[PDB]
Amino acid sequence: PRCWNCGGPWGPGREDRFFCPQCRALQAPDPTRDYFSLMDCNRSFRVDTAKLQHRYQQLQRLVHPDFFSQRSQTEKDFSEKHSTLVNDAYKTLLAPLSRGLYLLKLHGIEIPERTDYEMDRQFLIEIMEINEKLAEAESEAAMKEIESIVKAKQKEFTDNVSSAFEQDDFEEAKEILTKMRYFSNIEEKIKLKKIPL
Ligand SMILES: [Zn+2]
């Protein structure tokens, strides 16, 4: 690893290698750098979103294409690349759901796309019950009950998946996170139904 302007060696040291100490040029982003690192926090399901938002700004102060409009094409390139990554990381870590799923990827676990079959019975039952309820839900208050029901589950699940990580129990975390995916959809459908008011 070396600088595109100098040839200055990338030090085998600490992480934030945004600028070349030798020539001040904006460097190519490290593909290997995970989002928790880029957002300067521990690999953890638990994430301080006030801090996160602050980091997001610090970095966007450094790499956003606005500051590179008058600079070389190479720097414009990298400025755009970085700024995109910064956005990804931020969005990914901000949402507990995407955070959970991202946390699993690093721990080397890939997720099947909401595979409806690999699921257990009791949960399936819950899902078709919620469905029925929502389908039946036309009144504004019957609408509230579902929201409650859904949000009460969401909390329970967050607590659970938090534990799963605390214990390194990724097979469990993958389970619960696959569940949380369902309820997110249901949430979005409710919000979509809630538009006309
Ligand atoms: Zn350099």
Curated annotation (Swiss-Prot):
Domain of life: Eukaryota
Any single GO BP term: primitive hemopoiesis
Keywords annotated in UniProt: Chaperone, Cytoplasm, Metal-binding, Mitochondrion
Known disease link: Anemia, sideroblastic, 5: A form of sideroblastic anemia, a bone marrow disorder defined by the presence of pathologic iron deposits in erythroblast mitochondria. Sideroblastic anemia is characterized by anemia of varying severity, hypochromic peripheral erythrocytes, systemic iron overload secondary to chronic ineffective erythropoiesis, and the presence of bone marrow ringed sideroblasts. Sideroblasts are characterized by iron-loaded mitochondria clustered around the nucleus. SIDBA5 inheritance is autosomal recessive.
A single GO cellular-component term on record: cytoplasm
Protein name: Iron-sulfur cluster co-chaperone protein HscB
Residue ranges occupied by any J domain in the UniProt entry: 34-106
Gene expressing this chain: HSCB
Keyword hit for Ligase: no
GO MF entry, a single one: protein-folding chaperone binding
Shown part of the complete sequence: 39 to 235 of 235
Species per Swiss-Prot/TrEMBL record: Homo sapiens (Human)
Tissue: Expressed in lung, brain, stomach, spleen, ovary, testis, liver, muscle and heart.
Keyword Metal-binding: yes
Positions that bind a divalent metal cation: 3, 6, 20, 23
Family: Belongs to the HscB family.
Pathway listed: Cofactor biosynthesis; iron-sulfur cluster biosynthesis
Substitution effect: residue 23 to S: Abolishes self-interaction and interaction with HSPA9 and the CIA complex but does not alter subcellular localization
